[PDB]
Amino acid sequence: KSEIHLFLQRCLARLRGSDRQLPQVLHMSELLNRGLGVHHSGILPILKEIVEMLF
Amino acid sequence: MAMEMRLPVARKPLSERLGRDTKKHLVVPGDTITTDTGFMRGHGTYMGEEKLIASVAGSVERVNKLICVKALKTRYIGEVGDIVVGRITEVQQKRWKVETNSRLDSVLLLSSMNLPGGELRRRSAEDELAMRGFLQEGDLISAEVQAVFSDGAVSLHTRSLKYGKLGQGVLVQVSPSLVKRQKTHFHDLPCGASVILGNNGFIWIYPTPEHKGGFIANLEPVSLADREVISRLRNCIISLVTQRMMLYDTSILYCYEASLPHQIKDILKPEIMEEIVMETRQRLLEQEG
Amino acid sequence: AGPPTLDPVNDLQLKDMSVVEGGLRARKLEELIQGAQCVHSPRFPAQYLKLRERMQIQKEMERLRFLLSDQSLLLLPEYHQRVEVLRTLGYVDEAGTVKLAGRVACAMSSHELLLTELMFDNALSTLRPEEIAALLSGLVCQSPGDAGDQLPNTLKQGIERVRAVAKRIGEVQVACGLNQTVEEFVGELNFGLVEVVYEWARGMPFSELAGLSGTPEGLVVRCIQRLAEMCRSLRGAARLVGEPVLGAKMETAATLLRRDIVFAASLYTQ
Amino acid sequence: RRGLDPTGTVILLCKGRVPEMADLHRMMMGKPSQLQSQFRLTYTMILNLLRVDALRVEDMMKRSFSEFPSRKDSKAHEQALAELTKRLGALEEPDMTGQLVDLPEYYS
Amino acid sequence: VVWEEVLIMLPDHVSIILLSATVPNALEFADWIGRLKRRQIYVISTVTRPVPLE
Amino acid sequence: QWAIPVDATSPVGDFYRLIPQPAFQWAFEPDVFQKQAILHLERHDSVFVAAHTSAGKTVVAEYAIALAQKHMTRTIYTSPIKALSNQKFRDFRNTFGDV
Numbered sequence A: 001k002s003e004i005h006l007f008l009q010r011c012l013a014r015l016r017g018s019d020r021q022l023p024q025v026l027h028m029s030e031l032l033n034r035g036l037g038v039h040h041s042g043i044l045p046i047l048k049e050i051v052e053m054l055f
Numbered sequence B: 001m002a003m004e005m006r007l008p009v010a011r012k013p014l015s016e017r018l019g020r021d022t023k024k025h026l027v028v029p030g031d032t033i034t035t036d037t038g039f040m041r042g043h044g045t046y047m048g049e050e051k052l053i054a055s056v057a058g059s060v061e062r063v064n065k066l067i068c069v070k071a072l073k074t075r076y077i078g079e080v081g082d083i084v085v086g087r088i089t090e091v092q093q094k095r096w097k098v099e100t101n102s103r104l105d106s107v108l109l110l111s112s113m114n115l116p117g118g119e120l121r122r123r124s125a126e127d128e129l130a131m132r133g134f135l136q137e138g139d140l141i142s143a144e145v146q147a148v149f150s151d152g153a154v155s156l157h158t159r160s161l162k163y164g165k166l167g168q169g170v171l172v173q174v175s176p177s178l179v180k181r182q183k184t185h186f187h188d189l190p191c192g193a194s195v196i197l198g199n200n201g202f203i204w205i206y207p208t209p210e211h212k213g214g215f216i217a218n219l220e221p222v223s224l225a226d227r228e229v230i231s232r233l234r235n236c237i238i239s240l241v242t243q244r245m246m247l248y249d250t251s252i253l254y255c256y257e258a259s260l261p262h263q264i265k266d267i268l269k270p271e272i273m274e275e276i277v278m279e280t281r282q283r284l285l286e287q288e289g
Numbered sequence C: 001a002g003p004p005t006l007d008p009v010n011d012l013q014l015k016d017m018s019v020v021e022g023g024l025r026a027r028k029l030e031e032l033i034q035g036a037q038c039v040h041s042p043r044f045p046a047q048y049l050k051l052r053e054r055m056q057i058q059k060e061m062e063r064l065r066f067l068l069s070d071q072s073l074l075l076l077p078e079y080h081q082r083v084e085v086l087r088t089l090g091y092v093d094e095a096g097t098v099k100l101a102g103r104v105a106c107a108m109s110s111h112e113l114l115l116t117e118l119m120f121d122n123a124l125s126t127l128r129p130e131e132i133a134a135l136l137s138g139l140v141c142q143s144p145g146d147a148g149d150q151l152p153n154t155l156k157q158g159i160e161r162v163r164a165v166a167k168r169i170g171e172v173q174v175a176c177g178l179n180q181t182v183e184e185f186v187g188e189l190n191f192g193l194v195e196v197v198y199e200w201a202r203g204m205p206f207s208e209l210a211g212l213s214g215t216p217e218g219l220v221v222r223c224i225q226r227l228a229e230m231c232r233s234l235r236g237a238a239r240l241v242g243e244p245v246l247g248a249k250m251e252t253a254a255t256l257l258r259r260d261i262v263f264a265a266s267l268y269t270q
Numbered sequence D: 001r002r003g004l005d006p007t008g009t010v011i012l013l014c015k016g017r018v019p020e021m022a023d024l025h026r027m028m029m030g031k032p033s034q035l036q037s038q039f040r041l042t043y044t045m046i047l048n049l050l051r052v053d054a055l056r057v058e059d060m061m062k063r064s065f066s067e068f069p070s071r072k073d074s075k076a077h078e079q080a081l082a083e084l085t086k087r088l089g090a091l092e093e094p095d096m097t098g099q100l101v102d103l104p105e106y107y108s
Numbered sequence E: 001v002v003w004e005e006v007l008i009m010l011p012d013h014v015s016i017i018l019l020s021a022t023v024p025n026a027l028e029f030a031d032w033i034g035r036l037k038r039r040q041i042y043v044i045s046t047v048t049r050p051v052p053l054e
Numbered sequence F: 001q002w003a004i005p006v007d008a009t010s011p012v013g014d015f016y017r018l019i020p021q022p023a024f025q026w027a028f029e030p031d032v033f034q035k036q037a038i039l040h041l042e043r044h045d046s047v048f049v050a051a052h053t054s055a056g057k058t059v060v061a062e063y064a065i066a067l068a069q070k071h072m073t074r075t076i077y078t079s080p081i082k083a084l085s086n087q088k089f090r091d092f093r094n095t096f097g098d099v
Helices: A003-011 A023-033 A047-055 B125-132 B225-244 B249-258 B270-289 C017-033 C044-067 C078-089 C112-120 C130-138 C162-176 C182-187 C198-200 C206-212 C218-239 C244-257 D019-030 D042-052 D057-060 D072-086 D103-108 E001-009 E026-036 F032-041 F054-069 F083-097
Strands: B045-047 B052-054 B058-059 B069-071 B083-091 B095-099 B106-109 B140-148 B155-157 B172-173 B195-197 B200-204 E017-020 E041-045 F004-007 F046-050
Touching: A003 A023, A003 A047, A023 A047, A047 B225, A047 F083, B045 B195, B069 E017, B083 B106, B083 B195, B083 B200, B095 D103, B125 C244, B155 F054, B172 B225, B200 B225, B225 B270, B249 B270, C044 D072, C044 D103, C078 C162, C078 D042, C078 D057, C112 C162, C130 C218, C130 C244, C162 C182, C198 C206, C198 C218, C198 C244, C218 C244, C218 F046, C244 F054, D042 D057, E017 F054, E026 E041, E026 F004, E026 F046, E041 F032, F032 F046, F032 F054, F046 F054
Parallel strands: B106 B155, E017 F046, E041 F004, E041 F046
Antiparallel strands: B045 B052, B058 B069, B083 B095, B083 B140, B095 B106, B140 B155, B172 B200, B195 B200
């Protein structure tokens, strides 16, 4: 979980604060904390490649 | 040899020799064109206060919402996929500059050129030293427009087999409004020579390439029977272009046959053109009609 | 001479017009053959065989030319019917020559037919950029369509001035040789993402945009980057025509659409 | 992976009803579909090939893969055409005069 | 249709390397490619896929 | 004929006796079909491959990719799916060069 929280910390925090806290990114990174992941073309591409990076 | 020195003759106005009335709509700058609820301005007009005002002499042409004025004398305007003929006027570090009777110069990029070798070997900076050697100053090419820039400039490419540096022949420059739009601007007229009808007003006449890009020089003498054909086509093209005639394959073929009875040297007179253009006019009238 | 044969028409009650006509033709041909002349002469069979052989040879070479012929193509009639529909509309004039209206459609990306006639028929070119950036979304939104009655009074008018053009291209589509229904042509156009892209372009924060909009925010950015390409391609058409009234509001829309979340893309961009 | 696991498993999870095995064997145990062709025409292809003129729509029609089972033996086709046309000249004209005037009509 | 249009329009100075996954009738697909272009192609196929799975 | 199916065992008799100069080395061992394709690919030939493992077919692909920078040319990789389109880019980014 420390590795997850540091890779995600250097991934997600590269953009403006208004975009940094959005329901999609918190609702996916929360399930990523437990070790899950949902992948389909209806999510943001930056959130899309995070899952395959961890996988 | 007698060195004829004639005297000027007064011109007959109104084109009374045939007699026709136009059914078109003609305007001059300052005239107020139709000013209905909603219309879109074309090229040749501008807008003032709730008015569509013509800005150039010509005839209005509308296709279903569009008021525009077509002038009768302009310079060439570039369009995508248009056959042009030009001459190199500047050789730069990474480009050439070509003059094609436009409001600006045209750029031939080094990236788009069939370099010597004509196949896939390599493309790097070693070619840049000799690029300015073969396409030197004052050469003739025949390329196709690629895209339109943001200030009316045109970029032209030579990515085919029929395009590239041209060889021997003669060049005739006319106004870029006497060439009829078609789908085949390359011709192989069954007379003994060929022709390229440049959409910019450059007409290039060269002999047929015997059997079968500038790789071949072929700087050897051309047979006597070929020059007389080139001179005949040169004079016939001048004759049709002068009065009104729009140039394309059938008009030149028709006039060439009509020019056989008398010599190629003696056709420079004001009346011999009229007696040839009228005969071609009636041949077109009895064929199309 | 043969036992009495059953009538193909009356005995078996096969009331087919072709059968009756062929039977009558057969009886007439038999009657005419009974009065033939060539059967009687010295060498009818040999020259008859020669004529038969010549006819088979003729049939074979013409069949081979037809095999090596352009008319053998399957969809060539469909290509002709797809050219006549492109000629009834003033794009191609006569035998491979393209008009000015046929050169605008060449320099586009998608929906050339429905977008060029909108360019000519003035229904959008007299609106503000933040609005015309919303109507063009109906082409590429790719979502189920349910509008909102709280929209401005001009939008409930702005949607059928393009559906009329759809009911103007469908009629020439169907009655030209094509097998595509007029109604299903209009079914392609849907307006699910029409209001959301409006406040999105107006400059409203995305946080409440995702909350109020009833769709996941993964396809919105792709719809945006699809819309911006056609708005980037309408400038070349307005420049080709020479009508910068629309070519100015397209530039304003293009600069009004570029946000920073769109360009985020991947992690190691730079 | 290329040996980078012991084995692997593909579980089928049926959650609503029996899966009608007769098509399970049709899918699992069965050779893949033949490489067909779905060449089709759109306004975009014609518009793009109309402005520039180096190809034709008929050339793309004939050089496609849907016409392969017909034009695979074209050269033999015109060769046979030429041979059969040559055989036409070797046939003397059958007699059409005298009482053999009705011979072509009788043949028809 | 996307693949076919590219393959026909693709010039003759490029050596393509197709990588399918066990397509049955691959002995004539490359025949057609080798006949459309004046070029010679080679076909390779294998059996006995490793890491067996049930 | 334009179509030659090379036998699975007949052509290959040796691999390192030919190609005297080295190539894109692999940490693991190359299989018979990968060397079969590499032998033809060196002659600028056209190659068709029909196998089952995914990355096993990519060996000749990155052989061609590494061979292009020795020829200064360019290569195009086509992936008709978005997830796989960027995975190969990520694989070859840290591996070498610019993609």
